[PDB]
Subunit: 318 residues, 3 copies
């Protein structure tokens, strides 16, 4: 199969990056929906690297207000090694989350093989709080801070994060779908000059112009690998309700498919994160199926599935 | 009244073009919503040509996998004669469906009077499967193939389709709202070079630019009659749920109204089809009423109803 | 604090401008939602002037078909005095409605202090029916007619409105979200050449271009105070269902936030109306909460709440 359709599946059943239980069941419900089989039906070379075993760390004391540091740190350390392994074998790493703190591991691991990578962060939130700016102490709203080179010296010695080496610069990340940014996070965003397309920007320009500008900002000089970190809460709760931090007025089902269809077309998708799917937070079983089916569709569009249609290189009329 | 508001209503109670019963009740529920009365209030010259009597054909054996061949062929032959009769009487033919296989008859009948006509196909699907490329065998997903001049020789001698003569070229049809295109259908779409606006194009350009490009492509060279074949499944299941083949991430209620308002504005709407309203496939009676009201509003916008308002040619301030 | 964040809240519990009871509870439920507390958390200087006493006007027989003329007239006259008082204190007037007939008073009072003001009218309706063009006789669909200079000699001597002097020219008002315009209203809108952005224009251009054009049309020649008269029915009934006159295919939550975010950014918002919130017209208790939460979120965006985020002028990393 083609470079853009060669995949390495990594299940990441991890929840300790946030307090709401159930997000660890995210790979399980995505697998049950037949994601792996649906990718194979779409001419993909799928290798399953299995679901990562995250060992329970007893006496995991908090770093100030920051909850479960050793658990989050080790989970990302394990994921970093696994992403790097998948990348070394010439496959697009597909991380099935699990909470977004795992993006520390997913982006770090990918950067060990592809240091020149560009990040497209589709989320309602920036996840750029430092262990000092954070008000919740939930590490799922902190992964970008640990990854940015400009925030070196601003990140204190947090237990379980000694292995982390900042791999991405402020100029190498683009946000799409922002609508709930903390004051500390908004300060970082402005002072570091990070490129972002909040809901205000999406409303102003349209998803067409947003994607045009996103890809031109990262690829303009020359072709480079693309790491798409997709948080399902980036999409509106009418499409993805079964998530931990849902915010109204999000990206539509159509806009989400548009972002992913555009990234596939470049043939540069190198790393992918499908995060914050929480099957225990659906108000009805239909809300759960709706979130999962939306997340499956988002993933299928990243690896070829086009709304205009798809066809094998054969004569259907002969 | 004006040419753009002179209508000839044709009731098409037919379901044998697909296996889901209830789509034949479409004209009855559309009439019960007060469609004819609502049009007359909108300064329209409305003439009811009645509901076409489609006689049940016994021992109608399928051609390979193609279900009910004689029944579909006869229903479209009856509609072809009726549309032509309406068109000769200087009226805009309004076909109330019924499944989309009737479009063979509606377009063939319209083409007998106006051979220079252009087709605007609003649907989630292409309906361009040939009797050989089809996997389901349902003729409602096959009308474009029978009508296209480029597909002559690929269409075998299907019983009851001997009257069918290809009336339109690949260059005379524009699709709007595509999101579920079969591999065989996508092959035909690309190799014939048919102009299309799938949900990806709608998201990229916006419905404003989609309509600007659609009308410029078909009416650019010279003013030609417009045939609008509107499948209710073209619109999102949140607005048209009581339909046979619903597909997520559809055209909004607004976009649907904008397509129809822009077509009215040209003063070239010559043929209209309101297809796939199945009043027995709505989960609740509210879902049934929602589909019918959306279908009614779409039809009203085709014959003058503007969201900015409407006024009679009199002084309201006197 | 900032001029764009200095607020003077005016509770206008008035319903006699329409026949549906409960709209008088609009300032009560908006307060209960924590509007004042939320505004104060957004660095706003908030002064509460309380709910205006609308002393009963019994034996208020109709003027032709026009219902409750003296009650509407006096409620607007009293509101005008209070808006003018709030304006003289150097605060942005925030009128918590109540039905839209109160806009007669809100705009008149604001114009006494700032006669150079421009109006942004966010509604599904024009509310430009004269007491002679109105078919319902409900004064909530007549405020703009009493305010427009060009309609002088066209407004009959309605009891309770002798105090009214037209304060805005046809060229100083912009409509956003129109989809239910009466024939009499459409005649007025087109003959006076009033700038409007009906749902057709919003679909054609996108909310980005709509706001760019709206603000250029009003502030282009010279900078002047902006009066935002926001009817909650301007937004789709999927966001604001607890309202008197709901119309399908409305402005999205995102579009409403975009309009209000763009108005704040000018730093020229001087008058604001949050109208037609009716807590007694919710099909379920959730529909009531949804409307009030949408109305609160719209108001927060008018005074600084940005989706991209907000931060205090302090070093968040130190
Ligand atoms: O915990 C925090 O720092 C929060 C608190 C307020 N709401 C959000 C912004 N900052 C939340 C993060 C959500 C993480 B994620 O994008 O869902 O993965
Ligand atoms: O039967 C077929 O050929 C199908 C099968 C898969 N889903 C659709 C695309 N091709 C269906 C057509 C629906 C017809 B109509 O647009 O609803 O009128
Ligand atoms: O009463 C009238 O004149 C109406 C009648 C038909 N529907 C509307 C347009 N004209 C209604 C006004 C709604 C007022 B308001 O924007 O909700 O404040
Ligand atoms: Mn996230
Ligand atoms: Mn998030
Ligand atoms: Mn169809
Ligand atoms: Mn269809
Ligand atoms: Mn109003
Ligand atoms: Mn209104």
């Amino acid at each position: 199969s083609a470079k853009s359709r060669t995949i390495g599946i990594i299940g990441a059943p991890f929840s300790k990056g946030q307090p709401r239980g159930g997000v660890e069941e995210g790979p399980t419900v995505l697998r049950k929906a037949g994601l792996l089989e649906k990718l194979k039906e779409q001419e993909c070379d799928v290798k399953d690297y299995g679901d990562l075993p995250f060992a329970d760390i007893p006496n995991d004391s908090p770093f100030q207000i920051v909850k479960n540091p050793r658990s989050v740190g080790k989970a990302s350390e394990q994921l970093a090694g696994k992403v790097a392994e998948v990348k070394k074998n010439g496959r697009i790493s597909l991380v099935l989350g699990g909470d977004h703190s795992l993006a520390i591991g997913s982006i770090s691991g990918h950067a060990r093989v592809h240091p020149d990578l560009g990040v497209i962060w589709v989320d309602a939130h920036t996840d750029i709080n430092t262990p000092l700016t954070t008000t919740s102490g939930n590490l799922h709203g902190q992964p970008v801070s640990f990854l940015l080179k400009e925030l070196k010296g601003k990140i204190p010695d947090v237990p379980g994060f000694s292995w982390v080496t900042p791999c991405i610069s402020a100029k190498d990340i683009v946000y799409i779908g922002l609508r709930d940014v903390d004051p500390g996070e908004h300060y970082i965003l402005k002072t570091l000059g990070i490129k972002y397309f909040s809901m205000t920007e999406v409303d102003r320009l349209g998803i067409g112009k947003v994607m045009e500008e996103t890809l031109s900002y990262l690829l303009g000089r020359k072709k480079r690998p693309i790491h798409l970190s997709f948080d399902v809460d980036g999409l509106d709760p009418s499409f993805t309700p079964a998530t931990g931090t849902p915010v109204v007025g999000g990206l539509t089902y159509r806009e989400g498919l548009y972002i992913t269809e555009e990234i596939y077309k470049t043939g540069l998708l190198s790393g992918l994160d499908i995060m914050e799917v929480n099957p225990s937070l659906g108000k009805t079983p239909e809300e759960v199926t709706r979130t999962v089916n939306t997340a499956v569709a988002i993933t299928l569009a990243c690896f070829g599935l086009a709304r205009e249609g798809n066809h094998k290189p054969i004569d259907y009329l002969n």
